[PDB]
Design an enzyme around this catalytic site. Structure first.
Site, short mmCIF file in Angstrom:
data_model
loop_
_atom_site.label_atom_id
_atom_site.label_comp_id
_atom_site.label_asym_id
_atom_site.label_seq_id
_atom_site.Cartn_x
_atom_site.Cartn_y
_atom_site.Cartn_z
N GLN A 1 -5.48 4.85 2.24
CA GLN A 1 -5.30 3.37 2.25
C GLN A 1 -5.80 2.76 0.94
OE1 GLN A 1 -3.75 1.46 4.67
NE2 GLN A 1 -4.02 -0.29 3.28
N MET B 1 -1.42 -6.52 -2.44
CA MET B 1 -1.66 -5.26 -1.73
C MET B 1 -0.51 -4.26 -1.91
SD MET B 1 -4.70 -5.52 -0.51
CE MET B 1 -4.87 -4.30 0.79
N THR C 1 0.85 -1.23 0.00
CA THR C 1 0.00 0.00 0.00
C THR C 1 0.87 1.25 0.00
OG1 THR C 1 -1.82 -1.07 1.22
CG2 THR C 1 -1.74 1.36 1.24
N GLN C 2 0.57 2.17 -0.91
CA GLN C 2 1.26 3.45 -0.95
C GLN C 2 0.27 4.57 -1.26
OE1 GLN C 2 0.77 1.64 -3.64
NE2 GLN C 2 2.66 1.27 -4.80
#
Ligand SMILES: *[C@@](C)(CO)[C@](*)(O)[C@H](Cc1ccccc1)NC(=O)[C@H](Cc1ccc(OC)cc1)NC(=O)[C@@H](C)NC(=O)C1=CC2=CCC=CC2=C1C
Ligand SMILES: [Mg+2]
Ligand SMILES: [Mg+2]
Ligand SMILES: [Mg+2]
Ligand SMILES: [Mg+2]
Ligand SMILES: [Mg+2]
Lengths: 211, 233, 204, 196, 195, 226, 222, 196, 195
Positions: G1, B107, B1-2
């Site tokens: 997110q 992810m 995730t970024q």
């Protein structure tokens, strides 16, 4: 859902409803919540439908392999334990399963409750699902060991009906089973809509409801 | 995730009778800062495919390198690398779509929206979209970001359905694309005047146009607008 | 938790030829628990009919409120209120609680006594009027009712045909909703006669 | 937003871009951010458009009523009314206002009123999201007592750069000149200022 | 508090209410009477948040008693139930709502009929042949659905009520310390001292 | 919702689609989003549907009383000022996003107004979920010195773009034209490009299909004489 | 997110006849309030006289279908070109879905075809792998709009025979392929009217002993 | 921080301030932000000092090993090593690096590597918290092929303004000149640059 | 599960454990035996999170039985308790700890002495004359502090245990459905079938 199962003089009765919900939407009117693991073994389903189907069908694989290795049918106690140990592997991973393993073996008729936490309980009478409280009410007041097969089948049928009426997340139809030493016997699918009106008239119950 | 840092805005495209057109501006934004003004976001693969990319620029540069390496790898032990066994738009797209979906499944996505435009061996037009989620779809017109909201409505007035494609010429299609880029410059706060445009035709091949500018802009009417309601002077 | 789905219930209204119909289920519950199978959700003030879905306390409260207001209207105006006028009264009354609203989905149905024109209308909880020609739906099975009404409905139905259409729309929508059912009532309304029918349905 | 006000020999000039955004969408590309609260007292607005319009409308009301009773108000007086509103309602407001006006006695004056509600009198002022990018340029190129033409070029070049780097700024460059001669409105289009 | 039950038979209304009062992890009292006489032929049982219950019940009691003195007349159970509902519906949108659920059992001397009303803290009123609040209905309604007739005697009503309490005592994880049972009929209100 | 406002030579025109939604569900297929403040001042609203109505009726009521008090025809700037001050007071909690247009003795006017109380001026405007689709059309085809007929075409084309490309918009196109020195013409359902096709089957039931328990006559008449 | 899931809308419908089966689905693909494509095929011929549609999150839907098509291919390789029966395909798909029990394929899956006795078969799945054979099933965005209509018009629920007044039910007479297609078209036309994510086009795949046939119908584009 | 690198006729010059803050406390007022990864390949660091030091140390290691095997690396090659580290570890890093170097073949080159790990080759580059305030000034005053003395003045004036407006920037102005002649270090103190 | 008690008298150890098992709002079983025989003269009762309890108890049982077979010798209650403590202390820092509290009642045949060990889920071991887990001690320890002597007979130990259960039944809000009582002495382990 609502499921129940109880031991008695002539074996064990198993009765379940057939409703499935996705929120307040009724996704299924008739879903099979019993699994036939073998001619002498049954399994009820409450909770996540996927979890119930997958793990109990996987139990049947493992119960079948037991027969091939040992040349002998697995006990209800051993079958229930295998299942509870599967649940214990995915401990805290989010599985939702509540089942009763019903059958006949050397010790006589057997009934075990098993859930996602790994709990494994032996007992004469169990009921699982959102409508179990309504079913217990009828069962506790009318249950005897000295029940006839005909009266016992009706009790489990009538107990599900009670739950289907009051519980919004229980209904559709009733699936009956009777387990003997010669194996389990299916006693049909009974629509609740039709069954309700029939029971109301014949029994005189549900007086508050108009029909 | 970024989170995306340096970003590129809309990529727009459409089919026409003999091929496809794709376009994208030359800006690399750093939030509200219009940081980099010489960024090429249309990346040709051979002479039959152009990949247009929006979203994170660092991930774009990564994808650019994957495609450059893909061409190299396809030529290995391949005597027909510049002929029958050359890279097709469908091969290039499916590769990217595989990568995008795998990355989202770990992810750790490539924070992009991609449009692969090109012409196949049999002359068929190819135009398909893929994004950070691995979601894919095809349509006579395709656009990313703001382009989806403002460009598609204009481009769909030219090619509303499949049967309008053979009736649409390259001049009409290019005109529609250029008009759409002007509208985006009026209304997208993260866009620039300078842009690149590419045409892949089944007859004339790949035409790559750089250093294009939005022109014929309407601003004169601004002089008459005064205040926000009651002000006259 | 969601006030509009604790008690459950549905209401549907339809226009026909020189007639209107309005129907509702009879269920009242506390989430999963069914409490009453006699909780009628349709009321009438003169010849104007009002069905209300949603939070039961607010349903009861609003009935008593519109009874209050229509009785005063009648004493002062020396005539019964009409559906068009009542619809505006409902909208006004709901919007006056804009930032503390009644959690309801009202439905008005009736025939103008002067013009003879059939009328129905629906509202959101805050007063926005939906004046539809064909049908109005409200409740926990509103999605289900939209699908049934949209496919089963056709204009200019006669009273006894309209009865069958609206009844089937309600019944089958309720049978795909856990929080609706436990009985049903259908009102068939004509310019100077009104028939009320209790339907037979599954009680689960 | 990119706004500025600059004093010079003959008076004062207000300048602004014309872009209004809702996120990345440009809701209005020809906004007039130069607003009049009195004949020769104008302000440049930044922050919440709802808040700054509501404030400028109230100030215009106060200065109209002031004028009816006490005659033409000073630029300092106008800035004080802005301040009093911005300061006392600081918890419920997001407004950054530059006040600029011309007297015959005090000549051209500029006051800036940032978020808190403080007041600062200055030779020139810059504000808005795009102002950050021209602090260096404006500091290096500003001189006191410039001519009208020099001051127009200064504002044009300055806002040109703010627009160039700030995505929230853009469109046309509007200017208002405040002198003894009167009130002159100016406008400069992209094709003019982009090539600087 | 927890369990309150109600049943309307041929000629009377029977209310059963638990005796337990808990504070922290300790049962402070096992003989608490969760009820107030509103008028000679109207009884209200209650259950909800601590303190609020008694305050609400006594406030209602005071209002009905005030009405009785003013008019020299007993309000009908229906009228009382509507008054109570309105007070709760008024309460739910207040700054701090009263978290109280009630059953109102009364004998209407005009119509010569027993009447049972169930009202929750939101102001949700329903007239019923039998009723309960909270989780009590989950265990008991299946028995009542099965055994209940409208022509039942008071004695048969008590026997069916015993069966409901026995089921609660078996399947509830909660020890509610038995119930106090009261009967409301034409002759007024009386307590069953042995249950 | 898709709404537009376009100025032309001797006046102004507004237009809107006719779809109202409850999330992904279409509640009303023929909603009326063109509201009347005064005879020659019409507004069109997006956002919370009750708020756009209520706020329009309230200001329209006060505008009427103001017109009677002053013996003058109402001005658009009055409606604008009254609207924004009302909306500002409620700090965006009244979710009304409006395009206000009209003609008065001062001339023709076109304003937009947002829920928090900010207003804008323009020759062409668009609001709602389909504003971007509509604005793309307006930016492509709008010009200075439009005629009445060109402006109606442009306005309806802008609404169509929203109808086809925005899921929050659909069904029909409503228009209102306000020209100087004339009565305002409200063109309800100016376009009807989304008529439902004939169904393949009739679902009219046989009489007696539905099971019934009880029938009864409902007394709607008052208490009778004798 | 980062949110790995998305919603591409769409709606699907499977109906099992006496000796046939249909699997229909709209061709509109969407995100939020925008249209991605007016024609993006959603129902696929997977071979062995089986049709399939994975409705919901398109990326997961394409992945599942791709994996099942692959499973059919390897079933031929491993078991001497044996035909994969519909019940066997259904059980296989359960295990594909449950392999991601803790990171689910966000799709509602339906397959259709013929059972080993030649009768029409429809199987329906949940995202985590519960499945069961059904006669009638609508899935996706407008599923709640369509299912009640099918309960009424396919299984004749709440319908009784005139004159008897609720005593005798309407008999469950079988439906032809022409009759089923009418109910499918009306279901989607009605869903298109009241659901914003449904429209553009309707594609129906009909399965008989003769093979898999396709039919396409236009829907409203607003 | 205020850092910049500028190409000119004879090569390239790196420039930087010397202030390191921990909140509002100045932990070091004489920091050397100009760091050497190879003989004539230097970088300017911005962001986390821990991250940028760790990266520059690893890059120096890679280029030392590159040189032992393949000879003197290009400036593009050095920027690629920086990028590969900044891009692949973007979730755990906060580093904004400007790379600058001199070849005899390619002459002076400048690469900037912002937060994401993207690479951008430029004539000149600015970065750090203080860079925002000189986007306008640097754009207006930069020319290609300037002399050494012109380029030094350009960097001096630019960083002077960045320091003037940015509280996180300050101290001395350090510069490194990269040409064929060699490597020249420069320093400019407050009393010199403040009066510009 | 909830209540488990233990008392060490002159010549034996007595363990009392509740019979109730709850799932949701329903009591699924009222005859559950919350104990496992680890060896002929060592008994372990347990209470904690559902599922974990039985799994841990059976795992311990298997290990002690394995030891008994390997060495043909019964481990002392002290040795068993230390083994159990270590397993819990090992568990508390695991990825997912076992939330189980135990009482170990054993008769040491070497020393001819009864022994009671209390171990919580953290691995906190204490040897005691009487013990409990959870809230059980809050109600019972005052009675035990008062009445307990070390020279008590098994019969006196049972009478004092009855008094503890009676106090629990009075002051707990929780219906635990009575207790199963087991005695551990020189002759082994036996269950008191009437309690
Ligand atoms: C009561 C209905 C509970 O409300 C029963 O417990 C029932 C048991 C059961 C049903 C079917 C088969 C075996 C057992 N439970 C459910 O139906 C269950 C409740 C539920 C939901 C979600 C979770 O957490 C993940 C736990 C428990 N409902 C479901 O599993 C839902 C999700 N099923 C569907 O939505 C569903 C849609 C669908 C479409 C086609 C075919 C099957 C479908 C299903 C099962
Ligand atoms: Mg129902
Ligand atoms: Mg039910
Ligand atoms: Mg700009
Ligand atoms: Mg209630
Ligand atoms: Mg649609």
């Amino acid at each position: 859902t609502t499921t129940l199962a109880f031991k008695f003089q002539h074996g064990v009765i198993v009765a379940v409803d057939s409703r499935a919900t996705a929120g307040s939407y009724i996704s299924s009117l008739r879903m099979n919540k019993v699994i036939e693991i073998n001619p002498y073994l049954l399994g009820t389903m409450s909770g996540c439908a996927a979890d119930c189907q997958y793990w109990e069908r996987l139990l049947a694989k493992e119960c079948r392999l037991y027969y091939l290795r040992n040349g002998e049918r697995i006990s209800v106690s051993a079958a229930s334990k295998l299942l509870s140990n599967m649940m214990l592997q995915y401990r805290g991973m989010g599985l939702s399963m509540g089942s009763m393993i019903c059958g006949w073996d050397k010790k006589g008729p057997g009934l075990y409750y098993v859930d996602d936490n790994g709990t494994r309980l032996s007992g004469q009478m169990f009921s699982t699902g959102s409508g179990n409280t309504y079913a217990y009410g009828v069962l506790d007041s009318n249950y005897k060991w000295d029940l006839s097969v005909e009266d016992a089948l009706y009790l489990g049928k009538r107990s599900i009906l009670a739950a289907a009426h009051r519980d919004a997340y229980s209904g559709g139809s009733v699936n009956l089973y009777h387990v003997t030493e010669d194996g389990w016997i299916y006693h049909g699918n009974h629509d609740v809509g039709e069954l309700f009106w029939k029971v109301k008239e014949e029994e005189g119950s549900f007086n508050n409801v108009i029909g | 995730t970024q989170q995306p840092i340096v970003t590129g805005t809309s990529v727009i495209s459409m089919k026409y009778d003999n091929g496809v057109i794709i376009a994208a501006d030359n800006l690399g934004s750093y939030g509200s800062l219009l940081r980099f003004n010489g960024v090429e976001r249309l990346i040709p693969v051979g002479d039959n495919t152009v990949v247009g990319i929006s979203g994170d620029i660092s991930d774009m540069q990564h994808i650019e390198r994957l495609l450059k390496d893909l061409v190299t790898e396809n030529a290995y032990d391949n005597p027909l690398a510049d002929a029958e066994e050359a890279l097709e738009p469908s091969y290039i797209f499916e590769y990217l779509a595989t990568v995008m979906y795998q990355r989202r499944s770990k992810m750790n996505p490539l924070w992009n929206a991609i449009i692969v435009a090109g012409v196949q061996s049999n002359g068929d037009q190819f135009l398909r979209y893929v994004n950070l989620l691995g979601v894919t779809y095809s349509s006579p017109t395709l656009a990313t970001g703001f382009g989806a909201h403002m460009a598609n409505p204009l481009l769909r007035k030219v090619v509303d359905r499949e049967s309008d494609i053979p009736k649409t010429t390259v001049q009409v299609a290019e005109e529609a694309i250029v008009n759409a880029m002007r509208v985006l410059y009026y209304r997208d706060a993260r866009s620039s005047r300078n842009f690149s445009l590419a045409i892949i035709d089944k007859n004339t091949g790949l035409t790559f146009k750089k250093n294009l500018q939005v022109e014929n802009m309407k601003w004169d009417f601004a002089k008459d607008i005064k205040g926000y309601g009651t002000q006259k002077i | 938790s969601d006030p509009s789905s604790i008690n459950g219930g549905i209401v549907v209204a339809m226009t026909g030829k020189d007639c209107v119909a309005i129907a509702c289920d009879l269920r009242l519950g506390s989430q999963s628990l069914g409490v009453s199978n006699k909780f009628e959700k349709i009321f009438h003030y003169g010849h104007v009919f009002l069905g209300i879905t949603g939070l039961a306390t607010d349903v009861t409260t609003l009935n008593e409120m519109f009874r209050y207001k229509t009785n005063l209207y009648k004493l002062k105006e020396e005539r019964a209120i009409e559906p068009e006028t009542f619809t505006q009264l409902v909208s006004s009354s709901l919007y006056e609680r804009r930032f503390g609203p009644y959690f309801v989905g009202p439905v008005v149905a009736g025939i103008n006594s002067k013009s003879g024109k059939p009328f129905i209308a629906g509202f959101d909880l805050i007063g926005c009027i939906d004046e539809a020609k064909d049908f109005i739906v409200s409740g926990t099975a509103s999605d289900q009712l939209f699908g049934m009404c949209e496919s089963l409905y056709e204009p200019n139905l006669e009273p006894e045909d309209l009865f069958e259409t609206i009844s089937q729309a309600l019944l089958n929508a309720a049978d795909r909703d856990a929080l609706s059912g436990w009985g049903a009532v259908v009102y068939i309304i004509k310019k100077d006669e009104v028939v009320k029918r209790y339907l037979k349905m599954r009680q689960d | 937003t990119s706004i500025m006000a600059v004093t010079f020999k003959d008076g004062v000039i207000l300048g602004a871009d014309s872009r209004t955004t809702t996120g990345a969408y440009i809701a209005n590309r020809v906004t007039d951010k130069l607003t009049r609260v009195h004949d020769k007292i104008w302000c440049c607005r930044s922050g919440s458009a709802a808040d700054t319009q509501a404030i400028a409308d109230i100030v215009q009301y106060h200065l109209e009523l002031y004028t009816s009773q006490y005659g033409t108000p000073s630029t300092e007086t106008a800035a004080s009314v802005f301040k009093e509103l911005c300061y006392e309602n600081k918890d419920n407001l997001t407004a950054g206002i530059i006040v600029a006006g011309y007297d015959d006695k005090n000549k051209g004056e500029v006051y800036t009123i940032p978020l808190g509600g403080s007041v600062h009198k200055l030779p020139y002022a810059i504000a808005g999201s795009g102002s950050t990018f021209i602090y260096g340029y404006c500091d290096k190129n500003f001189r006191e007592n410039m001519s009208k033409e020099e001051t127009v070029d200064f504002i044009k070049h300055s806002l040109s750069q703010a627009i160039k780097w700030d995505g929230s700024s853009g469109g046309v460059i509007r200017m208002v000149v405040l002198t003894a001669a009167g009130v002159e409105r100016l406008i400069f289009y992209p094709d003019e200022y982009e090539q600087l | 508090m927890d369990i309150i039950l109600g049943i309307r038979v041929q000629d009377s209304v029977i209310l059963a209410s638990s005796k337990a009062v808990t504070r922290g992890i300790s049962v402070l009292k096992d003989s608490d009477d969760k009820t107030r006489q509103l008028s000679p032929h109207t009884l209200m049982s209650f259950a909800g948040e601590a303190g609020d219950t008694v305050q609400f019940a006594e406030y209602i009691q005071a209002n009905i008693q005030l009405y009785s003195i003013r008019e020299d007349y007993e309000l009908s159970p229906q009228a009382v139930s509507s008054f109570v509902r309105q007070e709760l519906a008024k309460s739910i949108r207040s700054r701090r709502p009263y978290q109280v659920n009630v059953l109102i059992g009364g004998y209407d001397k005009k119509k010569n009929k027993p009447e049972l009303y169930q009202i929750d803290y939101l102001g949700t009123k329903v007239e019923l042949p039998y009723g309960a609040h909270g989780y009590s209905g989950f265990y008991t309604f299946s028995l009542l659905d099965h055994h209940y007739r409208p022509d039942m005697t008071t004695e048969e009503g008590l026997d069916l009520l015993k069966l409901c309490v026995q089921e609660l005592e078996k399947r509830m994880p909660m020890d509610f310390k038995g119930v106090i049972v009261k009967i409301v009929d034409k002759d007024g209100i009386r307590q069953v001292d042995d249950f | 919702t898709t709404i537009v406002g376009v100025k032309f030579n001797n006046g102004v025109v507004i237009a809107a689609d006719t779809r109202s939604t409850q999330g992904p569900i279409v509640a009303d297929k023929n909603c009326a989003k063109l509201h009347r403040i005064s005879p020659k001042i019409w507004c069109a609203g997006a956002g919370t549907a009750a708020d756009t109505e209520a706020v329009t009726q309230l200001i329209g009521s006060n505008i009427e009383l103001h017109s009677l008090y002053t013996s003058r025809e109402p001005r658009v700037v009055s409606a604008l000022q009254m609207l924004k001050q009302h909306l500002f007071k409620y700090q965006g909690h009244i979710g009304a996003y409006l395009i206000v247009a009209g003609v008065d003795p001062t001339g023709s006017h076109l304003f937009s107004i947002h829920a928090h109380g900010s207003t804008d001026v323009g020759y062409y405007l668009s609001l709602g979920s389909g504003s971007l689709a509509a604005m793309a059309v307006l930016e492509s085809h709008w010009k200075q010195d439009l005629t009445k007929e060109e402006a109606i075409k442009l306005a309806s084309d802008a609404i169509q773009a929203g109808i086809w490309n925005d899921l929050g918009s659909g069904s029909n196109v409503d228009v209102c034209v306000m020209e100087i020195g004339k009565d305002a013409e409200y063109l309800r359902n100016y376009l009807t490009p989304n008529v439902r096709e004939e169904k393949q089957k009739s679902y009219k039931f046989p009489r007696g299909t539905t099971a019934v328990l009880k029938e009864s006559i409902v007394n709607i008449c008052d208490i009778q004489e004798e | 997110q980062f949110n790995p899931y998305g919603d591409n809308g769409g709606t699907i419908l499977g109906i099992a006849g006496e000796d046939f089966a249909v699997l229909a689905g709209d061709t509109r693909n969407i995100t939020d309030y925008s249209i991605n494509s007016r024609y993006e095929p959603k129902v696929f011929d997977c071979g062995d006289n089986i049709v399939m549609s994975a409705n919901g999150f398109a990326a997961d839907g394409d992945a599942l279908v791709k994996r099942f098509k692959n499973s059919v291919k390897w079933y031929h390789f491993d078991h001497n070109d044996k035909k994969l029966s519909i019940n066997s395909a259904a059980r296989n798909i359960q295990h594909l879905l449950y392999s991601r029990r803790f990171f689910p394929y966000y799709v509602y899956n339906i397959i259709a075809g013929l059972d080993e006795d030649g009768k029409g078969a429809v199987y329906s799945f949940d995202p985590v792998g519960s499945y069961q054979r059904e006669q009638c099933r609508a899935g996706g965005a407008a599923a709640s709009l369509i299912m009640p209509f099918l309960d009424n018009q396919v299984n004749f629920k709440n319908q009784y025979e005139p004159g008897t007044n609720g005593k005798v039910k309407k008999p469950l007479k079988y439906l032809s392929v022409e009759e089923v297609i009418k109910l499918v078209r009306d279901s989607f036309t009605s869903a298109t009217e009241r659901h914003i994510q449904v429209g553009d086009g309707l594609e129906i795949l009909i399965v008989t002993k003769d093979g898999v046939r396709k039919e396409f119908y236009e829907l409203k584009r607003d």
